[PDB]
From a paper:
For the levan utilisation system, the cell surface components are Bt1760 (a GH32 endo-levanase), Bt1761 (a surface glycan-binding protein; SGBP), [name] (SusD) and [name] (SusC)15,19,24. SusC proteins are unique among TBDTs in that they are tightly associated with a SusD substrate-binding lipoprotein15–17. Recently, we showed that [name] complexes mediate substrate uptake via a “pedal bin” mechanism. The SusC transporter forms the barrel of the bin, while SusD sits on top of the barrel, opening and closing like a lid to facilitate substrate binding.
To visualise potential different conformational states, we used single-particle cryo-EM on detergent-solubilised apo-[name]-63. Strikingly, several distinct conformations of the SusC2D2 complex are present in a single dataset, and after further classification steps, three dominant states were identified. Following three-dimensional (3D) reconstruction, electron density maps were obtained at resolutions allowing rigid body placement and refinement of individual protomers. This yielded structures corresponding to the three possible combinations of open and closed dimeric transporters: OO (3.9 Å), OC (4.7 Å) and CC (4.2 Å). With the exception of a few [name] loops (L6 and L7) and the [name] segment following the lipid anchor that serves as a pivot around which [name] moves upon lid opening, the conformational changes between the three states correspond to rigid body movements of [name]. Interestingly, the presence of the plug domain in the interior of the [name] barrel in solution is strictly correlated with the open vs. closed state of the transporter; only open states contain a plug domain, regardless of the state of the SusC2D2 dimer. In the open, apo state of the [name] transporter as observed via cryo-EM, the Ton box of [name] (82DEVVVTG88) is visible, tucked away inside the barrel, and interacts with the body of the plug. Hinge1 and 2 change conformation substantially during lid opening and are responsible for the majority of interactions between [name] and [name] in the open state.
Author numbering:
A (entry chain B): 134 to 1016
B (entry chain A): 1 to 552
C (entry chain B): 477 to 575
D (entry chain B): 330 to 378
């Protein structure tokens, strides 16, 4: 629920071990980064080329699938103008429950009496009046807090709700405007925009301004056509800090948000070192950045005789980003940054430009049509950045803290990158009867990161399809309308390797930068025995070592699909099957032994394979009730495997199992751990079990696999694979008279997750530091009084090693939640037409309203169980004026 | 448009084709120099300072008991694993210096003699550094893989073995670059950082004298000692080539271990540490970042043992007590001592680095361990806190330029050569060790004012001019090498060089079990615990091309 | 030295004109307000004592020497109201008044 | 432009989009004007003549 709305996208499941973002294409010019800053309302169609034999034309860098976006245009003979709006509200729903001061004292007392140590000899200001019952179990009679938190009476005690302190209701605004045009010789379009979002976590926001100009002009009987596409944005986001949900969980609730004076409260003594989260949000208030961005296109069309076009575009993609990050001095008990002030003034720059010149041909003779086209392509990326730094400022405000009003030391940074590409392609088409379709492509391409041994890479493709209902032996099946077979075989492969994969980097490293421990791989070495003076000579150490035989990560993907259409154009939908196999995945390997420093050579060996099904469907039919419905829906299926991994990189577990099992054979990211099946409920479990290290009345049992008294590290198995089956979705549309309702449902069945709020909410001592706040599930833990809970006992120390990976930390992540529901109301004809306008609307909608989960999940949100930005509920009350 | 593709250059770095250019030299040689000053962890110094706590002289200086853990397993010689991490770390940290020296040598091929008359000197310096690191690693493991060629591609560094060269061939390949340095080094370098003719002579003497003690098989036991190379040993230690260059004996033993004058006549080739030199905190001796005691805040590592202090105690004749010293607690107030006691180790009731405001007591402010290791501090690598030498970049480190080779070292090795040759020339080695003892006697000029306020008595009386027994003079020079080279990482290697190492270490264990609590359970097995084992990860990665040390 | 400067202006104005022609007289009266805001900036960097001397190695991360940093920021605003008039009365006697 | 004094130059790229759209009998008119440049000048030093 980040206000920027960024998204992690995977196409056809996981394809490659390293970076696999898809390639967006916005009006011919490509860019691999963005789309949460682009104007998301000038959209004409979004093709998604999931295949490889259909996406092989666009590049080597289309291994992860390409998402083709196009923008609007002027229609012939229309002058229309729209005006959208919205005003929303964001509400918080997924608050994890934490235990307040009385439950905190009860949990501390329960831990100390499960130790047997006197609970009144604790470091915190607690008083316990307790005794022994006749059945041996200790019962806490009275519990009393102190008045202040320390001896010097600086901080009072209270019961502060942290997740109610850093959280507000956040309004969301939106505006739009769009003007079109269009004649028989020209067209135009001109949009605007504004979108302001204020997040549910305090003092984070986002706002985007936008613009767009599109046009084209055809001159001499359509033999000369010039056009353009341009965009200009400005986003300005204050970013949430790192670990602000976890900090809001960690700090005990007895700490107040303020001191005796106006300063912030803190853990003054005994309580663990966690910073006040309200202070973290109050100091990360003016780290605002500013991001401009432009596009460009200038295509020139030319037809020499007939049916034979030419083209020459020119892309452009500029974007800079200015920031100014402050740091402040703080003081909360023992939490102090030692009186330090600084300001860093970053700046980054990007630049792309392309050029391509296709030349297509088109012929239709007999019952045959064909389309052949050839063309080249160019690219160049020129990134940058630099920075600054100052220290020890006097006044503490975001306008005094410019780097000239400082006194302390200073630093400076900076770098620069690059890229190039040049290619040639081709395509073909054929039908021969309007029955047997066929298409062949081929793209020869060579980048500037490939090794010296081979520049240019070749990528072939074959794709064929043929209809059924146009064959005359199937005319007896009249209720069917269309049925199309298709099959394809392509070969693509991306090149998102590092820029220095073939270069054998040497670097100065004088040693001005900091290294703790005294490692400090420097090149200074004072000669002449001076022992003083900063005039030392310098030299070069080696950074890494490159091979000259680097190579792209090729994938060979097949496909088999089936179309259908029935019942006088209804029940439309497809059914596909696919099998991809990447063959050269890059893994950087450390240099063995005698190679010494700088042995990290990038080699390419590794293979993954994916296979699954897709099945979409849609039923649109008007009923006799006076109603019209439409129900699109889709069901996917996914299955992964790693074919082979080369060396000891498969052993230590950078990708899969945690250093104890090989990954080869199983899926990607699968963790391997113990099996926890219950608690030591009875006394005879200490000898019914087999040679457990930590065996008490709690301390969950681990099953034997070798059945030899094995509580060794030879009892782990594959317990968790994150690739679920049966992912699905459903869109439902209703049309009563003068009304419309749109609903949605999305879900997935059979998901495993790794919860780390369960480790915080089921164990008293599992994290490193002590006396942390927890989640209030452990207050009903196992006791001699309550033997009817699966929560283990509350011990003060980790006697039995319970922080191991185990089946106790695997939940059922299956869910089904309504993404949005939207009700509208169209104003009728004559009342709208009295105001000289076409269409009017007053709609209402709400997002993320509900969710249903399984029994097997004790949490709050089945999508992200960990400590990320939460998902809030929106409620929108907008309109749509259409002239 | 292929020319469009080769138009972008990487920014902010230098690639690997212009690094072999003749104008960017006198940078790689300084880079190969600089790995000795910086490029070591506080757990692993290049002085071989932590890997000799098992040498009857150090209690490891534990703040806690098992805060290092594997160091305590190393000091007890029981339970050390082949998959330990200190061993792999010191293996990688020596081969990094090998890598830098080889890259500098590989760049030095493409020069000429027309404008560059210093090609032989720079090749000699880089070969000297490579041979020095190889000699240190052969001291550590004794079955290592030696790379000697400079024009070797990285594709075949993996396909190398250590069984292809036996021990005399390995010592000869170590001696190759030292002898080539002795061929082409100048007598006097103007800067004191670069090595000279005397340093190459001393390292050739070290390599030859370690080649002399024959090994002859997979067992690490002593066999028939070769005499053939001893002529080359006594040839390569002749005193006129050490007089050439001015490298002689200083006036005081407390002179070279004092930062107010660093480079003297005993500094044959030091390791130059400096402060306030442009970088972040200075090229300080971060290897001794734990040796400073509990006065500055942490970390009280490397405290000396009681057996060395009892080895300091002499008699009223001026001679060491031959194995009748550990029976009594050595006290300065009872009998005569050696004056180097106050130079090496600080005792309770004495100034710390000759500072009267820092008299040593036995409270918590001198040892975090209360009685687990005692109350001793080391003064060989620590200074007074009123230095500009100290700077606390999370650790207190000194700028004392650490010396690997001294004039007393080459003198005692010459004495060892003359006594092992024993072809009539015995008494001149006796005269030489008498000169060394007389220098040690006439070296006290700093602590001799402590007789009034404390009450001390010390005298080092040299012996007469008579050819004694062979074994008696062997024991005398071993006693002198023990009392001179205390806390300077030169005990365990000499014990394993002489071979008689297991029995004396077991005797130290059974006589120090009553002194320390951890030493009650101890043991040093034969033919297994002398050298450190080859690390498991290198053997696993080599696919059997490497080999294992004997008994492992 | 790696400088960088930035400028930013934006205005807004809303005029409202009137036009009449009766007899032999024409006139044009208009009123409107205006806004402005200037937000300039700059900053910089500095490094010293580089090893290789080429315009692509000399980025501020491949240095060894001392460093500095600079920067400032400026501003401006404005708000106004205006007016205009026209008159001819015969296509002979022209007159215009502003304020 | 490449100057008469050695190793000084100037080059400028440019663009421009202008439009307007009048909707309902000239009672609603939206328009725009936009420009985008890029100049890249190497400057002559101080006192080179």
């Amino acid at each position: 629920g980040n206000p920027s709305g960024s998204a992690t996208v995977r196409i056809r499941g996981i394809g490659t071990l390293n970076n696999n973002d898809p390639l967006y294409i916005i009006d011919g010019v490509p860019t691999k980064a963005g789309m949460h800053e682009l104007n998301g309302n000038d959209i004409e169609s979004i093709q998604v080329l999931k295949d490889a034999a259909s996406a092989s034309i666009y590049g080597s860098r289309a291994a992860n699938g390409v998402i083709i976006i196009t923008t609007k245009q002027g229609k012939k003979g229309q002058i229309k103008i729209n005006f959208d709006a919205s005003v929303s509200a964001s509400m918080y729903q997924s608050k994890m429950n934490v235990l307040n001061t009385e439950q905190y004292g009860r949990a501390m007392w329960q831990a100390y009496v499960n130790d047997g140590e006197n609970p009144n000899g604790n470091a915190l200001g607690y008083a316990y009046n307790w005794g022994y019952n006749a059945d041996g179990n200790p019962v806490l009679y009275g519990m009393t807090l102190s008045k202040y938190l320390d001896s010097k009476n600086t901080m009072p005690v209270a019961d502060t709700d942290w997740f109610d302190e850093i959280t507000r209701t956040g309004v969301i605004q939106q505006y739009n405007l769009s003007v079109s045009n269009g004649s028989e010789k020209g067209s135009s379009f001109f949009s605007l925009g504004y979108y302001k979002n204020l997040g549910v976590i305090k003092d984070t926001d986002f706002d985007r301004f936008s613009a767009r100009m599109n046009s084209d002009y055809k001159l001499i009987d359509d033999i000369l056509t010039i056009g353009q596409h341009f965009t200009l944005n400005r986003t300005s986001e204050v970013q949430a800090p790192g670990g602000i949900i976890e900090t809001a969980l960690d700090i005990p609730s007895a700490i107040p948000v303020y001191a005796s004076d106006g300063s912030w409260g803190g853990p003054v003594g005994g309580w663990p070192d966690r910073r006040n989260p309200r202070a973290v949000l109050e100091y990360n208030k003016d780290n605002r950045y500013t991001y401009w961005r432009m596009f460009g296109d200038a295509y020139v069309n030319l037809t020499p005789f007939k049916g034979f076009n030419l083209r020459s575009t020119f892309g452009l993609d500029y974007a800079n980003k200015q920031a100014r990050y402050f740091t402040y001095p703080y003081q909360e008990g023992t939490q102090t940054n030692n009186g330090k002030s600084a300001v860093e003034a970053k700046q980054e720059h990007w630049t792309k430009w392309m050029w391509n010149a296709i030349a297509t041909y088109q012929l239709e003779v007999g019952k045959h049509r064909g389309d052949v086209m050839i063309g080249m392509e160019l690219n160049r990326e020129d990134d940058s950045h630099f920075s600054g730094y100052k220290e020890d400022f006097s006044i503490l405000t975001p306008d005094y803290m410019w780097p000239d009003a400082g006194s302390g030391t200073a630093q400076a940074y900076g770098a620069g990158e690059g890229y190039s590409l040049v290619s040639f392609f081709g395509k073909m088409n054929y039908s021969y009867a309007d029955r047997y379709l066929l298409s062949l492509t081929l793209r020869r391409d060579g980048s500037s990161r490939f090794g010296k041994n081979h520049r240019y890479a070749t990528f072939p493709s074959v794709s064929l399809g043929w209809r059924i209902t146009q064959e005359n032996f199937m005319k007896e099946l009249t209720w069917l309308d269309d049925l199309k077979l298709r099959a394809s075989w392509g070969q693509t492969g991306n090149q998102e390797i590092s820029n220095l994969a073939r270069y054998t980097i040497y670097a100065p490293n004088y040693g001005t930068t900091d290294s703790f421990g005294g490692q400090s791989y420097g090149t200074a070495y004072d000669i002449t025995g001076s022992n003083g003076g900063g005039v030392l000579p310098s030299g070069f150490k080696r950074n890494q070592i490159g091979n000259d035989n680097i190579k792209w990560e090729t994938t060979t993907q097949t496909n088999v699909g089936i179309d259908f259409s029935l019942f006088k154009q209804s029940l439309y939908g497809s059914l596909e099957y696919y099998y991809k196999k990447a063959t050269d995945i890059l893994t950087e390997m450390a240099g063995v032994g005698v190679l010494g420093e700088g042995g990290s050579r990038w080699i390419n060996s590794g293979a993954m394979k994916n296979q699954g099904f897709e099945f979409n469907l849609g039923y649109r039919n008007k009923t006799a009730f006076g109603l019209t419905y439409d129900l699109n829906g889709n069901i996917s299926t996914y299955r992964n495997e790693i074919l082979e991994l080369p060396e000891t990189v498969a052993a230590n577990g950078k990708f899969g199992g945690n250093g104890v099992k090989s990954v080869v054979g199983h899926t990607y990211g699968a963790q391997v751990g113990y099996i926890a099946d219950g608690i030591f409920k009875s006394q005879d479990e200490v000898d019914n079990h087999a040679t457990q290290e930590g065996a008490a009345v709690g301390r969950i049992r681990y099953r034997d696999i070798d059945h030899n008294g094995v509580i060794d590290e030879r009892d782990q198995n594959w317990i968790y694979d994150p690739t679920p089956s049966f992912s699905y979705g459903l869109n439902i549309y209703l049309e009563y008279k003068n009304f419309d309702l749109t609903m949605f449902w999305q879900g997935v069945q059979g998901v495993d997750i790794i919860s780390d709020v369960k480790k915080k909410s089921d164990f008293w001592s599992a994290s490193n530091v002590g006396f942390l706040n927890k989640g209030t599930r452990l207050l009903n833990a196992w006791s001699p009084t309550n033997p009817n809970s699966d929560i283990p006992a509350l011990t003060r120390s980790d006697t039995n090693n319970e922080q191991r990976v185990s089946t106790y930390f695997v939940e059922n992540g299956s869910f089904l939640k309504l993404r949005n529901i939207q009700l509208g109301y169209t104003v009728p004809a004559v009342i709208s037409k009295k105001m000289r306008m076409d269409r009017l609307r007053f709609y209402c909608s709400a997002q993320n309203l509900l969710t249903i989960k399984s029994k097997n999940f004790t949490g709050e949100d089945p999508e992200n169980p960990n400590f990320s930005y939460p998902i809030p509920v929106n409620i929108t009350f907008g309109l749509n004026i259409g002239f | 448009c292929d020319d469009f593709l080769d138009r972008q250059v990487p920014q902010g770095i230098v690639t690997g084709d212009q690094i072999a250019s003749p104008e960017y030299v006198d940078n790689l040689v300084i880079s190969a120099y600089a790995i000795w000053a910086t490029g070591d962890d506080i757990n692993s110094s290049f002085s071989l300072w932590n890997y000799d706590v098992r040498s009857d002289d150090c209690y490891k200086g534990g703040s806690g008991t098992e805060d290092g853990g594997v160091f305590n397993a190393l000091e007890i010689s029981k339970g050390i694993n082949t998959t330990d991490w200190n061993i792999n770390d010191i293996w990688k940290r020596l081969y990094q210096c090998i890598t830098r020296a080889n890259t500098a040598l590989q760049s030095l091929d493409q020069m000429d003699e027309k404008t560059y008359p210093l090609k032989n000197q720079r090749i000699a310096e880089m070969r000297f550094l490579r041979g020095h690191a190889h000699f240190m690693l052969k001291q550590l493991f004794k079955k290592i893989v030696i790379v000697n060629d400079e024009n070797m591609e990285p594709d075949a560094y993996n396909e190398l073995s250590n069984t292809t060269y036996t021990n005399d061939e390995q010592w000869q390949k170590i001696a190759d670059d030292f002898q080539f340095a002795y061929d082409n080094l100048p007598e006097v370098q103007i800067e004191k950082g670069r090595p000279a003719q005397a340093a190459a002579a001393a390292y050739l003497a070290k390599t030859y004298l370690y080649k002399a003690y024959r090994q002859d098989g997979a067992d690490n036991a002593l066999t028939g000692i070769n005499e053939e190379d001893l002529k080359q040993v006594v040839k390569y230690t002749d005193p006129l080539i050490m007089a050439k260059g001015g490298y002689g004996l200083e006036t005081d033993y407390s002179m070279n271990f004092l930062p107010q004058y660093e480079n003297g006549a005993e500094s044959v080739w030091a390791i130059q540490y400096s402060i306030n030199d442009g970088t972040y905190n200075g090229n300080l001796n971060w290897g001794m970042g734990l040796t400073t005691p509990q006065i500055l805040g942490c970390c009280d590592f490397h405290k000396p043992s009681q057996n060395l202090v009892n080895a300091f105690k002499t008699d009223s004749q001026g001679k060491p007590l031959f194995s009748t010293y550990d029976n009594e607690n050595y006290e300065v107030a009872t009998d005569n001592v050696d004056p180097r006691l106050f130079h090496t180790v600080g005792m309770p009731g004495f100034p710390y680095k000759y500072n009267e405001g820092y008299i040593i007591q036995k409270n918590d402010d001198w040892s975090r361990s209360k009685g687990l290791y005692g109350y001793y501090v080391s003064l060989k690598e620590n200074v007074d806190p009123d230095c500009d030498c100290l700077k606390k970049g999370s650790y207190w480190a000194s700028s004392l330029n650490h010396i690997v080779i001294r004039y007393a070292d080459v003198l005692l090795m010459r004495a060892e050569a003359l006594i092992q040759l024993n072809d009539g020339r015995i008494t001149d080695a006796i005269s030489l060790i008498n000169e060394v003892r007389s220098r040690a006697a006439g070296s006290t000029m700093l602590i001799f004012n402590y007789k009034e306020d404390y009450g001390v008595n010390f005298k080092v009386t040299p012996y007469d001019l008579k050819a004694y027994a062979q074994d008696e003079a062997m024991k005398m020079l071993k006693w002198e090498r023990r009392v001179e080279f205390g806390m300077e990482s030169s005990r365990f290697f000499d014990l394993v060089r002489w071979g008689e190492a297991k029995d004396v270490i077991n005797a130290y264990y059974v006589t120090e079990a009553s002194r320390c609590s951890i030493y009650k359970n101890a043991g040093f097995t034969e033919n297994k615990n002398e050298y450190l084992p080859v690390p498991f990860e290198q053997i696993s990665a080599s696919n059997g091309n490497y080999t294992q040390n004997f008994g492992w």
